[PDB]
Amino acid sequence: ACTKNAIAQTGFNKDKYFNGDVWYVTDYLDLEPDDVPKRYCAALAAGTASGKLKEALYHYDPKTQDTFYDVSELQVESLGKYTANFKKVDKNGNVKVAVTAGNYYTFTVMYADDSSALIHTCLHKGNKDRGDLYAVLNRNKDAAAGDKVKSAVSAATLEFSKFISTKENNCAYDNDSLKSLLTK
Ligand code: HEM
């Protein structure tokens, strides 16, 4: 189960974060052991589509090849803290698993700037929940974490040395699909 109430960035700039562009996960920290594979790749696009806050997600296991996309409308809990009801889609936005109650994740932006971010997420999915997950994001694929986001990791009382890098997996990303999905 999840255990953390992540605190959102003071002065979080929502329009900058939710600008329709792509964020790549470069490093992640799962608090629960064996909650996720040790080799993984993920990215998301976050934007507003016809007035609604939206995220599109991409997950790829670089070993098993398991791949899936999701689209969510976000509801606001407070500035920088959201609840997202996801539907699983193909890369084109065709629905594979409909939105359903109990299938949701929370999403807190703990730090963000032009190029980087630190987020916390808590996934709830039927009988397949996920414990707390933190992720370092960058606008550039596989970019090394800069001093600002690393300092934010420290300020959150987390040890960056514990984060797992995604940069050494052979991962490729369909940016174009992620952007398109925002409207789906
Ligand atoms: C590298 C970082 C991440 C890893 C290693 C990871 C790992 C996983 C894994 C292994 C699953 C499979 C669950 C299953 O088999 O049903 C999953 C599902 C999911 N994750 Fe992640 N995840 C990451 C980042 C994220 C982020 C940043 C978000 C939200 C912004 C997110 C949201 C979700 C959602 C919504 C599902 C269920 C999708 C569906 O069933 O349609 N994940 N994740």
Q: Is the CB of 17 under 6 A from ligand 1?
A: no
* DSSP reduced 3-state for 175: helix
Residue whose Cα lies nearest atom 29 of ligand 1: it is 121
Ligand 1 proximity of 148 Cβ (cutoff 6 Å): no
Give the start-to-end residue ranges of the domains of the chain: 1-184
d(CA 121, ligand 1 centre) in Å: 9
DSSP H helical ranges for 9-162: 14-17, 147-155
* Start-to-end Cα distance in the chain: 30
| CA nearest neighbour of 54 among 33, 39, 71 | 71
Q: What's the CATH number of domain 1-184, 2.60.120.10, 1.10.10.10, 3.30.70.1140, 2.40.128.20?
A: 2.40.128.20
CA distance 43 to 71: 12
Which residue positions form the known binding site?
59
**DSSP run (H or E) holding 22:** strand 22-30
DSSP for 139-163, written as a single string? SSTTPPP-HHHHHHHHHTT--GGGS
Q: Which atom of ligand 1 is nearest to the CA of 42?
A: 1
Provide the resolution (angstroms): 1.3
Q: How many CB atoms lie within 10 A of CB 119?
A: 25
Phi and psi angles of residue 108, each rounded to the nearest 5 degrees, phi first:
-120, 125
Q: Where are the alpha helices (DSSP H) in 27-172?
A: 147-155
The CB of 56 under 6 Å from ligand 1? The reply is no
